[PDB]
Design a protein around this ligand. Structure first.
Ligand SMILES: [Ca+2]
Length: 183
């Protein structure tokens, strides 16, 4: 697992999320541990307004993304801010998205309007970011403090490639204020 602090992060290549057209089922899965009430868990924006992000808001997990005609917001029922490990599964196909925490009833919804694709080829940020306020366009002012493990970034296009937890140490790209995290 990977530990983060003071906006620490780990960056991965935007091809982990190899998107298509028609839109194809998108899977994000991870295990988090943190005492953070507000902060950035994941962000991929275009490097143009399209993005995808997972964050902490009032302890609550939030799934947000923009496809061109308005954001989707999906917030978990309770905070997962308790420093105990929590499984978060965020899924999206086109504008339809959902989140599930552990075994809690899944929250579902969509983005409004006709846009249906995330045109974002930027790096995928986890944990934090070099400068969060700029990257997130004002939506987050910090990363989280804690762990992430069994990160799964899957795009499910007809051939390529099977959905399994990414190796955080060698399968990364950028990185700051981060160290291996035990469990
Ligand atoms: Ca778009």
């Amino acid at each position: 697992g990977a530990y983060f602090h003071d906006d620490g992060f780990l960056a991965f290549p935007g091809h982990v999320f190899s998107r298509s057209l028609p839109e194809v089922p998108e899977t994000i899965e991870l295990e988090v541990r943190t005492s953070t009430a507000s902060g950035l868990l994941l962000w991929q924006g275009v490097e143009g307004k399209d993005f995808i992000s997972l964050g902490l808001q009032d302890g609550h997990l939030v799934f947000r993304y923009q496809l061109g005609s308005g954001e989707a917001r999906l917030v978990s029922e309770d905070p997962i801010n308790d420093g105990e490990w929590h499984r978060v599964t965020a899924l999206r196909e086109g504008r339809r998205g959902s989140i599930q925490v552990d075994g809690e009833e899944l929250v579902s919804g969509r983005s409004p309007g006709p846009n249906v694709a995330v045109n974002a080829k930027g790096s995928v940020y986890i944990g934090g970011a070099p400068d969060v306020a700029t990257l997130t366009g004002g939506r987050f002012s910090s990363g989280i403090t804690g762990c992430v493990k069994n990160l799964v970034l899957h795009s499910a296009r007809p051939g390529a490639p099977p959905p399994q937890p990414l190796d955080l140490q060698h399968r990364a790209q950028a990185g700051a204020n981060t160290r291996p995290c035990p469990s």
